[PDB]
Design a protein around this ligand. Structure first.
Ligand SMILES: Nc1ncnc2c1ncn2[C@@H]1O[C@H](COP(=O)(O)OP(=O)(O)OP(O)(O)=S)[C@@H](O)[C@H]1O
Ligand SMILES: Nc1ncnc2c1ncn2[C@@H]1O[C@H](COP(=O)(O)OP(=O)(O)OP(O)(O)=S)[C@@H](O)[C@H]1O
Ligand SMILES: Nc1ncnc2c1ncn2[C@@H]1O[C@H](COP(=O)(O)OP(=O)(O)OP(O)(O)=S)[C@@H](O)[C@H]1O
Ligand SMILES: Nc1ncnc2c1ncn2[C@@H]1O[C@H](COP(=O)(O)OP(=O)(O)O)[C@@H](O)[C@H]1O
Ligand SMILES: [Mg+2]
Ligand SMILES: [Mg+2]
Ligand SMILES: [Mg+2]
Lengths: 320, 257, 341, 331, 330, 256
DNA sequence: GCAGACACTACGAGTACATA
DNA sequence: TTTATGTACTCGTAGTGTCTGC
């Protein structure tokens, strides 16, 4: 068993703030914090895979250098971050006396901060308020709703947005030029379409296509990784002909190996996130999709139930 | 009458042997043979491996013509050993490929007789031929000293790093409270031969281990007066506790990076 | 006690002057009790099913079933909630009801039936109001009576058949209890009053009680006792037919719905419904009474009546699958107001 | 005579199951071999799944090994996710018991033990998901037999792993030999078409037929006239509506007049018949008639189906019956 | 296990022991083999319907990478094992952090049916995967994707296991018949293809039960007739006759025909409903209202049958629904 | 009218410690011959009988027969002051709705008086149908508790197969099986450990687990416990006392 | 050595969340 | 605030063990 090569997701992880693409204003603000040194408490939020925790790690590396071994305390969901056994850890770390450069402070990376309990954040409130001169915190959560409002009242809100296609394409081309793999622009746009602004997904699909076919042409890309089924569901629900919707359902989901419950949940999510049709029509569509969802969850999962769901969706859509 | 008979001199020996590695292992696979009884068992995390072996000299009487694979459960085994007077003479009894074994908790030497039985467990995992190899180092320190050092260092960090270089043993454990650096210089004493820090040297080793697993190792220090540790960069750590007629190893897997 | 409903109850099948065919069938079962299967008596409430059960019990073993005692049993559930439910036990039988909270009566059934099955060969287990079981204790019962049967027997009493699942219907013998005829109601009331000391001008009062009771002998006896107490132990031919205050509230609600069909009247309807649900009333019977009182209003049309009955069926289906009955009842009243307007 | 006729005549051999010939032959030929798959018995109640599995276990091991190599669970027993994760897993991973010389010589003892999960459709999906890999991993030592009367409650992976044996409903043609045998053994005087009526009323089950036969025989013994049990006594004891009352219901429905049908439904429900039986009688009367139009039959079939489903939900049967009759009356 | 093979069901006897023995998923198998020969193995996520060969593929993969004793070098966790967040914090963390105990290789963690893990467990597993990915690879087998955290989905390479096509089932059946000294008629093979519905375990179970069905295991060939009695599925000719009687013949004839077909060999109304659904999907209907009415009414009937009820009323409902739906078309 | 003065405070407490788990409450009946308090468990299976003599436990003065029904939790809470030297005093006046439990200590002058509420029960049935038992067994109670807890930990069902010269205890469970056999052995030097099983008819009865635990909980009442077994009859677990004895009954559940 | 003191692991009851 | 399992967290308590001491 030979030692595995490090995956391109981790091999080409950025180590400096310049390499992170997307959200130019946020990255420039982070760079100005980096050279300025006056890091405030911040909470970083966004959709997964767009570069949240890597910016935190890069900023922690840049602000303080050889002190990175002991000047930063990183915590995560794998560590049992509770109210009692962990309040002492941050209390000691903030109370720990370590000599920094004049404009640098200790960093407490509470990575994946949306999973902590309420009491832990309640203690962290005064923990942050007391030793603000010595230590600074860095929350990195997918969802900022779990963080209580006292924590939001003393933090710098840094909202990341989903990456534009141009930035993903730019960093992808950088990766190709460092790896020297033959590429076609159609294949690259296929990767961009499949990723949906999720960068790690783009890198993983690039890995699979490169190591599966050598060439990243569009046919090989669509052979290896399938198109995202939310788009297929949205296409199916928006069709005007019932026969067309049924054919799309069967061919693209039932013959491709998709569970009925997955189709129902994706249809519910697409309907609630859809905006072209009238609001009320979306309300009855959601009600019918939920009725079919109850039928599926109660035990009867069949192509017939999905076909009936589509038939009634067309009944509401075509206005009787 | 029964094919497999193993009458211990005292139930205390088997109780101590079972309680030595009861905590760190859930499923045990005994393999009785004419040369003795062995037990190769793996932890749930598949990091710590226990290789019990009891020689024929630790049994007052022993006889087992056909090899027997006794896959068992240590929780229920210890529960069975929990009941019964410790002075009593245990006699392990099993049939030809049976569904259970019989624990003769013969009280004193007469009167009360117990027939506790534990249903045999189907463990299809074969024994692992991890005996030994060319180990880089071979040290030997008293069990009490090692247990005290491990217990002291476990409170300071979650990882204990054992370093051997130029006839010197060094334990370091950097953590949040502090960083212990307990060091030992090898020596030998004729006055008290039990306390002697023996050592061998081929190549320096710097291997780190978890704290909870090392505590699990030192829980078994009551069995042996001496513990022998052998380390290598391309081998799991070996902790050979010497018994009255056999031994009890502890193949611990070091961390990487 | 001084109540006449529990003072004159036929102890034996010989005193069951109610149904000749049903008494003969029960006597046929009691003829050879060595192989008596599990029973399930169904019919309108107030018919006297429990009376037949006790009469059959004393015909199987002998006198002494009618002596009863109370034995509170402590039962523990998930977490440490305490819902100690008493059992009305006795020699030769055992009487249980699912008066405990419906979500966790399954444990009551499980451990109590397992405890009684640890051993005159069998002890009958009467389960009053079996239609209130929540399809979970019935699942336990499926194998409970099937596995242990030579030691335990069930007389499963329920006033409705629909909530009882198919296997329970399959493994239990079905016995039908029709409601009394009006002539039989009058005869029973006449026997009670001649054993009592109430003076009657004419037996037309007994017939009026029979008509108003709608085949329910228990409420018939209760109303006769109330009238006799109110009429100074001398019934009057012009005495008004007294109704339960619940019936009065339902009829006033129906009148308010019929006359005023605005949102405000729906607010007072909701308040009245809140009071009625606070007054220990099941949702099925209140919706049934509201529906049948609405259909008895003469100013309605046949189309409105059909719409009302169809939405009543729909919302009764909703009651059978819902938790908070107030929302379903308010929705039914809203639909009725929409149809009538 | 210490037991009811349902359990007194419960089959004790695999050949005694006088229905489901395919499943019984498959299980017998498997009994000759040792390749017993993970079974999944399903079908209507009373078709004989529990009897079949008990007979199969008894013929496989014998009376001595029932307590050692059989683990039966019910909804009466606690069947949470913890029970599936610990009790079932432990019993599965234990080795098989030791067969004696007598058991091995007389019975075809196989080297596995069967875990019977009766009424398994009541378990939560999480427990079944936990049971999946327990079923898969220890296949060489234990067999799982899932006995549920509803397939849809069993999740897809278990239906994939388990071999399915549908237990067909026992109609008049399939299960007339059993009733004739029971009548011969119990000396029950019977008419010519009485057993056909019993099997017709007992919709797809034999336990109900046996119970009805026992009740009719007990009544005949009480009367003691030595008279053959007619179809009338069985029809009355079965709880089905007599034809006169059904004709009256149809006559009231045909004329309309909501007040009249409401009054007659009130009186009918006062007499207290089971509404499911009334719906069944109305279905077998209206559909089989030839005096009604095609469109009427379509609409009345849909109405009867909707009423039957609503009754099966467990609702107040009076309102459902009145609604069905009024909807039919306006056709 | 006991008595080696020949005492196991055909489901667990014919389990692939090599990546070459997995049929159908040619692209996935070839990509995985290329991955392991080139030395790179990212975090794999196998998604697909039941019976498509996910856990068989990953077991064959672990057997190929490691030695015969793959279970000594792989921490394979399933829903039977407790997988709380404490388990992730202790067992997974210790297995990922430490070095291999039997040889020199990367740790491999296989999480079969990982969709049953809680949200907090997946949240911890996120950082556990991302931190110790240098010498530890995670494989996640999930039938359902909606139960997986999107963070977990964005971390593992997604491989989709399609339902088995005709050729793969035919090849596996040919291998099984060659091994078992059994003969089977091609029409029976086509019936098995239609009965499988993309599942392989169903095929193996039906073959086992049909071999048990035959009086003489040798000599006699398995025809589609034996398939149809052994599985109990309706024959296509029966479905065609029932549908023709419903469409053209009147209520007396259609009801009598359906009752006779059901009572001939104990058919159930279920499997017959979706047999009729397949046949009607094989039709062209001018009016969409016919399709709408058919789908809605048949779904309601199938739901009611799933909840159980009276079979006669449900059969009458099926006939009425079909006959009312094919009169709005004209 | 009731003057049940008790010599030791932590003696009636020792008795109610055993009384606590056998039954929730008892209906006391005090007579000049002795104190009897029998109660029926919630299952109507386990029967507890109480008998207290007059020679010991200080002077007993029961002028009138008094029947009192009260709980044991509050009684234990009041008796928590159970010093080795403290005594007890029971006083019941006319309409004794609140019994005053006087504490007087010989070693110290400190006094303690508390009032116990009385609930309205007025229900007590005393019937001892059987006295003849096939097998009478005396053995130390601590060993009985030990063997019962060891067998009940392994299995939930306990059966006894009394044969010639063997008092066989067998416990079959899913985990395993425990078959402990004790022989009648009497040492004149150690009366407590002496074991005698009188033999008239062999007894094979299958018992439970929680009932056996409740029985063995009161092991400290007697050094030697009298165990009586009768075929097809309720068991009798008689615990001796300095003045009187306490016997426990149980139905031998059996379904084969 | 027996007694107290000591801090440790183990156990039980209570609360709060459950889709983005 | 009822809901009704399963999960996870937190605290509190009861013993159980080895460690100092006279
Ligand atoms: N803007 C970016 N520029 C370059 N690489 C990026 C960028 N965003 C993400 N990546 C790549 O994404 C991988 C890791 O992304 P992460 O920042 O760890 O994901 P994340 O933002 O933390 O989302 P979650 O919530 O943790 S799953 C590495 O391979 C990075 O190279
Ligand atoms: N094929 C059969 N042959 C003979 N008796 C049968 C048959 N099927 C059912 N029975 C009778 O049905 C009774 C018990 O059947 P069961 O096996 O309990 O039905 P079931 O499969 O358990 O239905 P459930 O569990 O309620 S879904 C006995 O009286 C049997 O004699
Ligand atoms: N492609 C295939 N080639 C050959 N046999 C297959 C194939 N797919 C499935 N099988 C058979 O199906 C049996 C069970 O399927 P598995 O692959 O073990 O489980 P699975 O397909 O992952 O389904 P789940 O999701 O785990 S329930 C195996 O033992 C094989 O005999
Ligand atoms: N044959 C009878 N003669 C006189 N009264 C009867 C007869 N049968 C029943 N009853 C009356 O019925 C009442 C009991 O009804 P009950 O069994 O409670 O009905 P339900 O079981 O529907 O609640 C008794 O008060 C009794 O007087
Ligand atoms: Mg991150
Ligand atoms: Mg059954
Ligand atoms: Mg799998």
């Amino acid at each position: 068993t030979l030692s595995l090569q490090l995956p391109w997701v981790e091999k080409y992880r950025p180590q400096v703030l310049s390499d992170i693409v997307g959200n130019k204003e946020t990255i420039d603000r982070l760079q100005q914090i980096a050279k300025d040194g006056n890091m405030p408490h911040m909470i970083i939020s966004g959709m997964p895979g767009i570069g949240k925790t890597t910016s935190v790690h890069c900023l922690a590396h840049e602000l303080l250098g050889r002190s990175y071994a002991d000047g930063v305390l990183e915590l995560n969901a794998s560590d049992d971050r509770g109210i009692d056994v962990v309040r002492n850890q941050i209390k000691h770390f903030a109370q720990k006396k370590l000599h920094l450069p004049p404009g640098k402070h200790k960093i407490v990376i509470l990575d994946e901060a949306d999973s902590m309990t309420a009491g832990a954040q309640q203690a962290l409130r005064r923990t942050m308020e007391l030793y603000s001169n010595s230590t600074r915190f860095a929350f990195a959560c997918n969802q900022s709703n779990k963080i209580i409002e006292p924590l939001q009242s003393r933090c710098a809100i840094l909202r990341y947005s989903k990456l534009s296609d141009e930035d993903v394409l730019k960093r992808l081309l950088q990766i190709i030029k460092l790896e020297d793999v033959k590429y076609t622009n159609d294949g690259l746009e296929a990767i961009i379409f499949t990723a949906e602004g999720d960068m790690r997904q783009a890198i993983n699909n690039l890995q699979s296509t490169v190591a599966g076919h050598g060439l990243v042409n569009a046919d090989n890309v669509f052979k290896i990784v399938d198109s995202p089924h939310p788009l297929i569901v949205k296409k199916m629900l928006l069709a005007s002909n019932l026969e067309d919707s049924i054919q799309i359902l069967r061919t693209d989901l039932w013959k491709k190996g998709y569970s009925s419950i997955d189709i129902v949940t994706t249809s519910f999510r697409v309907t609630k996130n859809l905006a072209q049709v009238k609001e009320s029509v979306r309300l009855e569509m959601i009600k019918e999709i939920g009725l079919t969802h109850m039928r599926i969850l109660e035990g009867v999962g069949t192509y017939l139930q999905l076909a009936s769901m589509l038939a009634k969706i067309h009944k509401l859509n075509n206005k009787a | 009458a029964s094919m497999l008979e193993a009458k211990f001199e005292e139930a205390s020996l088997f109780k101590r042997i079972i309680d030595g590695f009861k905590d760190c292992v859930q499923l045990v696979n005994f393999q009785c043979k004419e040369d003795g009884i062995i037990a190769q068992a793996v932890d749930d995390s598949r990091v710590l491996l226990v290789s019990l072996e009891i020689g024929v000299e630790a049994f007052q009487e022993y006889r087992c013509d056909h090899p027997v694979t006794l896959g068992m459960d240590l929780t229920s085994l210890s529960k069975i050993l929990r009941c019964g007077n410790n002075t009593d003479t245990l006699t392990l009894i099993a049939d030809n490929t049976p569904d259970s074994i019989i624990l003769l908790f013969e009280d004193t030497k007469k009167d009360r007789i117990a027939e506790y039985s534990l249903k045999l467990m189907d463990i299809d995992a074969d024994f692992l031929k991890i005996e030994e190899l060319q180990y880089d180092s071979t040290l030997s320190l008293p069990s009490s000293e090692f247990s005290k050092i491990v217990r002291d260092l476990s409170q300071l960090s979650d990882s204990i790093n054992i370093m051997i270089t130029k006839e010197t043993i060094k334990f370091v454990a950097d953590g949040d409270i502090g960083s212990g650096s307990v060091i030992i210089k090898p020596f030998v004493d004729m006055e008290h031969p039990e306390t002697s820090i023996k050592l061998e040297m081929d190549q320096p080793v710097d291997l780190t281990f978890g704290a909870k697993y090392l505590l699990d190792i030192i829980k078994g220090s009551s069995l042996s007066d001496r513990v022998g540790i052998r380390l290598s960069s391309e081998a799991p750590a070996l902790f050979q506790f010497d018994l009255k007629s056999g031994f009890l190893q502890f193949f611990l897997a070091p961390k990487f990076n | 006690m001084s109540l006449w409903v529990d003072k004159y109850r036929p102890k034996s099948l010989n005193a069951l002057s109610h149904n000749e065919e049903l008494t003969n069938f029960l006597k046929s079962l009691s003829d050879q009790p060595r192989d008596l299967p599990h029973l399930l008596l169904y019919g309108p409430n107030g018919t006297g099913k429990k009376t037949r059960c006790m009469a059959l019990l004393e015909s199987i073993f002998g006198p002494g079933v009618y002596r009863l005692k109370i034995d509170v049993r402590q039962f523990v559930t998930a977490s440490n909630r305490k819902l100690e439910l008493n059992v009305v036990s006795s020699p030769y039988h055992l009487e249980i009801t699912p008066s405990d909270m419906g979500n966790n009566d399954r444990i009551v059934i499980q451990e109590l039936l397992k405890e009684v099955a640890q051993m005159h060969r069998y002890k009958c287990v009467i389960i009053n109001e079996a239609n209130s079981l929540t399809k979970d204790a019935q699942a336990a019962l499926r194998r409970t009576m099937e596995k242990y049967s030579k030691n335990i027997r069930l007389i499963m009493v329920c006033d409705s058949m629909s909530p009882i699942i198919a296997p329970i219907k399959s493994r239990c013998l079905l016995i039908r209890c029709p409601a009394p005829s009006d002539s039989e109601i009058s005869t029973i009331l006449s026997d009670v009053v001649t054993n009592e000391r109430i003076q009657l001008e004419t037996k037309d009062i007994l017939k009026r009680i029979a008509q108003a009771s709608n085949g329910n002998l228990r409420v018939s006896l209760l109303m006769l006792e109330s009238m006799a107490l109110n009429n100074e132990l001398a019934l009057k031919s012009s005495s008004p037919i007294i109704k339960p205050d619940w019936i009065i509230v339902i009829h006033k609600l129906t009148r308010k719905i019929v006359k005023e069909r605005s949102v405000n009247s729906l607010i007072e309807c909701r308040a009245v419904l809140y009071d009625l649900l606070a007054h220990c009333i099941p949702a099925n019977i209140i919706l049934k009474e509201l529906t049948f009182s609405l259909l008895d209003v003469e100013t309605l049309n046949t189309t409105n009546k059909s719409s009302i009955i169809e939405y009543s069926s729909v919302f009764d289906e909703r009651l059978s699958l819902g938790n908070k009955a107030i929302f379903h009842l308010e929705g039914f009243i809203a639909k009725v107001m929409c149809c009538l307007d | 005579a210490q037991q009811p006729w349902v359990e007194k005549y419960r089959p004790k051999n695999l050949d005694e199951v006088t229905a489901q010939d395919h499943a019984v032959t498959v299980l017998k030929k498997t009994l000759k071999s040792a390749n017993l798959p993970h079974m999944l018995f399903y079908g209507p109640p009373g078709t004989g799944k529990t009897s079949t599995i008990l007979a199969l276990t008894k013929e496989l091991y014998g009376p001595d090994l029932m307590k050692s190599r059989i683990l039966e669970l019910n909804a009466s027993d606690e069947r949470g996710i913890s029970i599936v994760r610990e009790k079932v897993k432990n019993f599965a991973r234990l080795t098989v018991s030791k067969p004696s010389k007598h058991d091995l010589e007389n019975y075809p003892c196989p080297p596995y033990k069967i875990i019977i999960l009766d009424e398994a459709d009541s378990m939560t999906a999480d427990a079944q998901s936990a049971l999946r890999r327990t079923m898969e991993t220890y296949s060489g030592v234990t067999r799982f037999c899932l006995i549920c009367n509803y397939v849809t409650r069993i999740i897809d992976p278990l239906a994939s792993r388990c071999s399915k044996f549908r237990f067909k409903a026992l109609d008049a043609s399939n299960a007339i030999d059993r009733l004739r045998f029971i009548s011969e053994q119990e000396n029950v005087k019977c008419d010519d078409g009485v057993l056909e009526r019993i099997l017709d009323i007992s919709a797809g089950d034999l336990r109900r037929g046996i119970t009805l036969l026992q009740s009719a025989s007990k009544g005949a013994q009480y009367l003691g006239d030595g008279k053959n049990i007619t179809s009338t006594q069985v029809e009355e004891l079965a709880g089905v509506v007599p034809h006169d009352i059904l004709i009256e219901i149809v006559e009231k429905v045909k004329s309309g007049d909501f007040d009249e049908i409401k009054k007659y439904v009130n009186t009918f429900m006062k007499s207290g018949w089971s509404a499911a039986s009334v719906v069944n009688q109305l279905h077998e009367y209206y559909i089989t008639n030839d005096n009604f139009d095609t469109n009427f039959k379509n609409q009345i079939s849909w109405l009867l189906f909707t009423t039957d489903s609503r009754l099966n939900n467990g609702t107040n049967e009076h309102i459902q019956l009145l609604n069905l009759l009024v909807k039919i009356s306006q056709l | 296990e006991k008595r080696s093979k020949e005492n196991l069901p055909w489901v667990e006897k014919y389990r692939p022991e090599t990546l070459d023995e997995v049929y159908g998923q040619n692209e996935v198998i070839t990509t995985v083999r290329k991955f392991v020969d080139e030395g790179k193995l990212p975090h794999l996520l196998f998604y697909g319907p039941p019976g498509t060969g996910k856990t068989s593929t990953i077991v064959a993969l672990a057997r190929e990478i490691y030695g015969k004793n793959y279970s000594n070098m792989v921490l394979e966790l399933n829903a039977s094992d407790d997988r709380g967040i404490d388990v992730v914090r202790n067992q997974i963390k210790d297995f990922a952090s430490t070095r291999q105990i039997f040889s020199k290789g990367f740790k491999l963690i296989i999480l079969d049916e990982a969709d049953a893990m809680t949200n907090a467990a997946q949240n911890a597993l996120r950082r556990v995967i991302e931190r110790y990915t240098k010498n530890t690879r995670f494989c996640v087998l999930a039938n359902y994707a909606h139960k997986l955290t999107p963070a977990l989905l964005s971390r593992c390479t997604r491989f989709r296991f399609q339902p088995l096509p005709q050729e793969a089932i035919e090849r596996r059946i040919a291998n099984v018949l060659v091994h078992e000294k059994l003969k089977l008629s091609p029409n029976a093979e086509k019936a098995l293809i239609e009965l499988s519905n993309g599942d392989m375990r169903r095929v193996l179970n039906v073959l086992q039960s049909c071999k048990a069905t035959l009086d003489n295991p040798d000599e006699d060939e398995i025809s589609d007739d034996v398939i149809y009695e052994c599985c109990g599925a309706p024959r296509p000719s029966d479905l065609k006759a029932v549908l023709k009687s419903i469409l053209e013949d009147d209520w007396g004839t259609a009801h009598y025909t359906l009752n006779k077909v059901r009572s001939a060999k104990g058919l159930a109304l279920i499997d017959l409903i979706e047999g009729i659904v397949k046949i009607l999907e094989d039709y062209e209907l001018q009016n969409e209202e016919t399709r709408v009415h058919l789908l809605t009414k048949l779904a309601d009937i199938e739901y009611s049958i799933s909840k159980g009820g009276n079979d006669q009323i449900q059969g009458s409902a099926v006939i009425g629904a079909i006959k009312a739906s094919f009169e709005n078309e004209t």
